[PDB]
Design a protein around this ligand. Structure first.
Ligand code: SAB
Ligand code: HG
Ligand code: ZN
Length: 257
């Protein structure tokens, strides 16, 4: 099974998932001086007021907070998006050290972690159908830097103990995702893909310019999770990120200048 170890990491993925060497793979390095400011880009419209979190689960490679996507409860629209995208789940990618962890980089700079808010285009009926379309998903990427503690992240941090190993889950209702958003919504956008296998190229990436701050203690608890299942030898869940991929025939557009 794919992973992040020396023997099953990103460099091995192409063998089981040929698309790893595709034309629009993610993440990518964002060159701020080459990004094109596009005045036609509309502002982002994030409507998370009716968000309904359900559960938090350790899936062996990260922990996902799942949301009820049966109706337009938490949606994303505007920006470079055409149509409404529903929030289905959010996860993080982090490193073993504060100087690494993010998947996307800015001018080669790596952040301590990266939050991914995954959304699927509603015109496609369900997530399964969305992952078969070039415009099926929209992931909102947010960088995390170590500094002051993020209050809205604490409830997520406190529940990590119960989902220490792969396969474990815990009820996680009434969590407001808006507490994880930065002040500004300025972003960079480009067509890409999932950063983990199957690496499907169905994503319109929206990476926010402004990072959020989290405390050393908060990030530390992320590192206490396990890749392994209960009863198996312990493997600390750290460095679950993929290196930058070639931009190729793509242009990153900025909503700001
Ligand atoms: N068949 C589709 C795959 C099912 C499970 N994987 C996902 O849904 C998924 C979603 C977002 C990212 S990421 N990291 O790019 O936000 C990575 C993976
Ligand atoms: Hg696709
Ligand atoms: Zn991700």
């Amino acid at each position: 099974h794919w992973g992040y170890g020396k023997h099953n990491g990103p460099e091995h993925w192409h063998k089981d998932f040929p698309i790893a060497k595709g034309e629009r793979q993610s993440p990518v390095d964002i060159d701020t001086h080459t990004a094109k400011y596009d005045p036609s880009l509309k502002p982002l419209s994030v409507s998370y007021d009716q968000a309904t979190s359900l559960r938090i689960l350790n899936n062996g490679h990260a922990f996902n907070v799942e949301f009820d996507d049966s109706q337009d409860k938490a949606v994303l629209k505007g920006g470079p998006l055409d149509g409404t995208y529903r929030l289905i789940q959010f996860h993080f990618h982090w490193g073993s050290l504060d100087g690494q962890g993010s998947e996307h980089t800015v001018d080669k700079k790596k952040y301590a972690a990266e939050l991914h808010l995954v959304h699927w285009n509603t015109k496609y009926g369900d997530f399964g159908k969305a992952v078969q379309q070039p415009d099926g998903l929209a992931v909102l990427g947010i960088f995390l830097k170590v500094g002051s503690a993020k209050p809205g992240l604490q409830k997520v941090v406190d529940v990590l103990d119960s989902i220490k190993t792969k396969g474990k889950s815990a009820d996680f209702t009434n969590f407001d995702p808006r507490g994880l958003l930065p002040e500004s919504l300025d972003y960079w956008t480009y067509p890409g893909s999932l950063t983990t296998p199957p690496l499907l190229e169905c994503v319109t990436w929206i990476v926010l310019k402004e990072p959020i701050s989290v405390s050393s203690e908060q990030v530390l608890k992320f590192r206490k999770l396990n890749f392994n299942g209960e009863g198996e030898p312990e493997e600390l869940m750290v460095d679950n990120w993929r290196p930058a991929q070639p931009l190729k025939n793509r242009q990153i557009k900025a909503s700001f200048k």
